[PDB]
């Protein structure tokens, strides 16, 4: 599992559950090709998005549906979504955890890139 | 000044200076149209992107070129950029400050929205 | 104004107003001595805590009463407060902005340190 | 394991390894009683600090030695340490993960409190 996404709710101090996540790969035309998607589990985690074979070097975009999340919970959110865009390269570490910490008007994202 | 961007460097504890910022608006046909652009000043602030008259209701995307920033300082950053996408002015005109706090593998963004 | 504190509310996207802030200095005997205190203004800023003359080298602790803030707004926050502890002025006088971004179960703090 | 501490390095996008962590409980005199301590593992995690029996309601302080961390890595840090102070109460969720995300001049901390 070379790409994992983990989402936390900073208001309630919990996993952000059933958050929709879509992953895209940049195509040679520079448009965004759907690659993978899923919803975060009860632990705020989304595993099994891709495989080592499929997850080649390229520029990837991870779009987190934060607006839908806050809407279901009765909170008026600022952002339409949280976008994370990065280049996956073969030379260094290559398990990627994209972590997102969510508030109605703020989010932070952090990549933990390990062996 | 209804739209302002402030960018801080969390490694140096300083404003993040000369960071390129591009702003787009979603058009009727659902494409991103160029709206404004600029660079942060010595104070890490970017003012004057737009005017009250021009800054109508819409979905806006603020793209902060964090990669060029970190690269020019010798670091090899994780993100291509930091994108902030939001609906603006749909309860009427507001003033928006988009704050970004930058580290090589992490960033946070915050909106401060005030009533003029 | 060598020491300033700015506090933002990440739930409301607004400055965090009327937040109590207490500042202590570590004394020769290793105890925390009261140094200054105040409340954030309508802009979430707290200015005038000290002067250049008074703000000598030392280890300082800035205690932000986030609990009372969230409690008065109906939320039941996780933290008792947000503490920021730092050595000041040991390469000579600097100006310090301590920024805190607040959520009920999370906060981040950032220092912007500039050369007067 | 009702108290877990997890530390990340936002500069390198990795676990913050071998970070010293001390936990204190507030005594009735209002002084801070050493309770538990440890160093973060290779995954940035510190488990086994306490047990359900020992971890009674009270006010706890978790002190993370961030300065030593940055110093060993050649980065000039701002903070003397990162302090997290909270009340542990019996009524709601009670596994606590204290997460810290570290930069030289900034840190964020987040509590994930689950069943």
From Swiss-Prot, chains B, C:
GO biological process terms, semicolon-separated: negative regulation of glomerular filtration; phototransduction, visible light; purine nucleobase metabolic process; retinoid metabolic process
Assigned keywords, A-Z: Amyloid, Amyloidosis, Cytoplasm, Disease variant, Gamma-carboxyglutamic acid, Glycoprotein, Hormone, Neuropathy, Phosphoprotein, Secreted, Signal, Sulfation, Thyroid hormone, Transport
Annotated phenotype, changing residue 26 to N: In AMYLD1; amyloid polyneuropathy
Effect ascribed to mutating residue 36 to D: In AMYLD1; amyloid cardiomyopathy
Effect on the protein of changing residue 59 to L: In AMYLD1; amyloid cardiomyopathy
One Gene Ontology cellular component annotation held by this UniProt entry: protein-containing complex
Cellular localization per UniProt: Secreted; Cytoplasm
Effect in UniProt of substituting residue 78 to M: Loss of tetramerization
Effect of residue 115 to S: In AMYLD1; uncertain significance
Consequence recorded when altering residue 38 to R: In AMYLD1; amyloid polyneuropathy
Assembly and oligomerization: Homotetramer. Dimer of dimers. In the homotetramer, subunits assemble around a central channel that can accommodate two ligand molecules. Interacts with RBP4.
Domain remarks in the Swiss-Prot or TrEMBL record: Each monomer has two 4-stranded beta sheets and the shape of a prolate ellipsoid. Antiparallel beta-sheet interactions link monomers into dimers. A short loop from each monomer forms the main dimer-dimer interaction. These two pairs of loops separate the opposed, convex beta-sheets of the dimers to form an internal channel.
Family statement: Belongs to the transthyretin family.
Protein name, UniProt field: Transthyretin
Name of the gene encoding the protein in the UniProt record: TTR
